[PDB]
RNA sequence: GGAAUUGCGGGAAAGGGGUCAACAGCCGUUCAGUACCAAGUCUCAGGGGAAACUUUGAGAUGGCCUUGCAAAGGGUAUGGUAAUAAGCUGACGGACAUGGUCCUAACACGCAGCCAAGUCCUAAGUCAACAGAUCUUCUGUUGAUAUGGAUGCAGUUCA
């Protein structure tokens, strides 16, 4: 089969930076050469196709190329509405194959996160469990660490984590920690606390509550 | 608007067959070829199958060969993929996509939004959902506990509300249910006045919530 | 002295000019429709030719994806259309800011025309070698040979 080897596997690059994602054809496939755009949990969308034509509906600032066997999606100011996985896709002999994709995320300034903590509703603690959920919303850069604590002890294993795709208008994600308790253990303890370290913090904050009606 | 609309993948047994459709609407099927894509969760696209524009030609992939069979329905204007035998290779969303007749060395210009097939011996199980409780602006939110198979997609205030709302990517549980939430940060003066309402719907479970969420007392 | 040195297509740098914040322009893997089915290659038939070839008619193939090529692969009348098959018309969709589009256009590329050379085909005519005699004249085979052709990527300039 024909392989198409997608380079940059994952990218991150200023609004206005010119994007370049290249894609080596194992063999010829002369300019049988597609690029999509997929965002997020929605099917691919055409781009480029015979390695350099436009597709409808796809801004101008994307074009594509061929140099022989090499192939280049160059995108030429990035906007923020452009966060994707980028494919190739070669149709010149069965089967079709697509690159393995290119992962383009917007860059912008630093946004330290904004934290909320949720504790257990009743009718869910009633029921035997609690989830306690720590919200990080509309912050810049991905990375972000959330440690759990209940009174004081430092938890591992009972969390789960989950983020957004990265916002098309402002280009943040918002992150949501869930510490999974047993009631039992839920109220055996009062102090509920969610530690955040991230770059746009100079020190991790905490947002905590206390177990009761009050 | 010119478009491919998918249905018909959801959660199957393993051995099981599921029947994909796929109706073209705004163009015309007998000038297309129909390709089927798949993508594991969170993984690449794979091209499965096709049938090319003629409707003779069809291609299937080694591993899915015997297995699936692509036919089309003229009068319709649908193309089908009848997948059986499955197992778990082959849980992944599955997309339509189709070319211009002829235009063999282009890409696929319409795709189907894309259908979840699942291939588990676990039941359905419908969410519990839980208000995330506000407590000069707040946070709310509903929490989508224990549920299978995917998905659940959650608007608030029947789509009224969309500024300010993340619905995260729902987690699998240690459990083997999902779980997700979805939080709107929301002017605090308008939380004694307006009436916010998570409204989670859970098709493979033939289940939708509203869940109006309010503030508590602490 | 005379002939010929050609007709075009799709692009397009630079400077200038018109126009468009979404265009009666431009782009389309959308829908419907009008007109049309080229060149090349092959086969036969009518006309020319010694032949090779040529011209006309019919058929096959071709054409599209593919404007570097298009063998392979797919498509191939449910198809196709640049310059010798509308790349047409309407609708629908779409792109555009020191951007889109149009005019002006260097320039290269492409489709054709004419084609020097070269190649290749043919060998009527002629020549040669051998052979044959009909007595001063001859015919036979084998070969070569264009001045016959087809092909032809050179050239197609200056103003
Ligand atoms: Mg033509
Ligand atoms: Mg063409
Ligand atoms: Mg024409
Ligand atoms: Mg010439």
């Known amino acids: 089969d024909i392989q198409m080897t997608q380079s940059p596997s994952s990218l991150s690059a200023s609004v206005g930076d010119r994007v370049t994602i290249t894609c080596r054809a194992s063999?010829?496939?002369?300019?049988?050469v597609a690029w999509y755009q997929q965002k997020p949990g929605k099917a691919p969308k055409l781009l480029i196709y015979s390695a350099s034509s436009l597709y409808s509906g796809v801004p101008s600032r994307f074009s594509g190329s061929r140099s022989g066997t090499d192939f280049t999606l160059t995108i030429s100011s990035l906007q923020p509405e452009d966060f994707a996985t980028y494919y190739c896709?070669?149709?010149?002999?069965?089967?079709?194959?697509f690159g393995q994709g290119t992962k383009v995320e917007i860059k912008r300034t630093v946004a330290a996160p904004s934290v909320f903590i949720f504790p257990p509703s009743d009718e869910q603690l009633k029921s035997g469990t609690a989830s306690v959920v720590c919200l990080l919303n509309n912050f810049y850069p991905r990375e972000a660490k959330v440690q759990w604590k209940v009174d004081n002890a430092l938890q591992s294993g009972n969390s789960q984590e989950s983020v957004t795709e990265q916002d098309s208008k402002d280009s943040t994600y918002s992150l949501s920690s869930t510490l999974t308790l047993s009631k039992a253990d839920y109220e055996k303890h009062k102090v509920y606390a969610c530690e955040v370290t991230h770059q746009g913090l100079s020190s991790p904050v905490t947002k905590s509550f206390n177990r009761g009606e009050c | 608007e010119v478009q491919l609309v998918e249905s018909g993948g959801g959660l199957v047994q393993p051995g099981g067959s599921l029947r994909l459709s796929c109706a073209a609407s705004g163009f015309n099927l007998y000038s297309s070829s129909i390709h089927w894509v798949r993508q594991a969760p969170g993984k690449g696209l794979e091209w499965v199958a096709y049938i090319s524009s003629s409707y003779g030609y069809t291609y299937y992939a080694d591993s899915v060969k015997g297995r699936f069979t692509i036919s089309a329905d003229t009068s319709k204007n649908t193309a089908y993929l009848q997948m059986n035998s499955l197992r778990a290779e082959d849980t992944a969303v599955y997309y339509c996509?189709?070319?211009?007749?002829?235009?063999?060395?282009?890409?696929?210009?319409?795709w189907g939004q894309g259908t979840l097939v699942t291939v588990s011996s676990a039941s359905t199980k419908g969410p519990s959902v839980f208000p995330l409780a506000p407590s000069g602006t707040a946070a709310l939110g509903c929490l989508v506990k224990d549920y299978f198979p995917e998905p659940v997609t959650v608007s608030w205030n029947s789509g009224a509300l969309t500024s300010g709302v993340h619905t995260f990517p729902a987690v699998l549980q240690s459990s083997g249910l999902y779980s997700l939430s979805s939080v709107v940060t929301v002017p605090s003066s308008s939380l004694g006045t307006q009436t916010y309402i998570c409204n989670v719907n859970h098709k493979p479970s033939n289940t939708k919530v509203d869940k109006k969420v309010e503030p508590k007392s602490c």
């Open positions: 896709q070669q149709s010149y002999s069965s089967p079709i194959t």
């Open positions: 996509a189709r070319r211009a007749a002829g235009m063999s060395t282009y890409g696929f210009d319409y």
């Open positions: 063999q010829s496939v002369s300019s049988a």
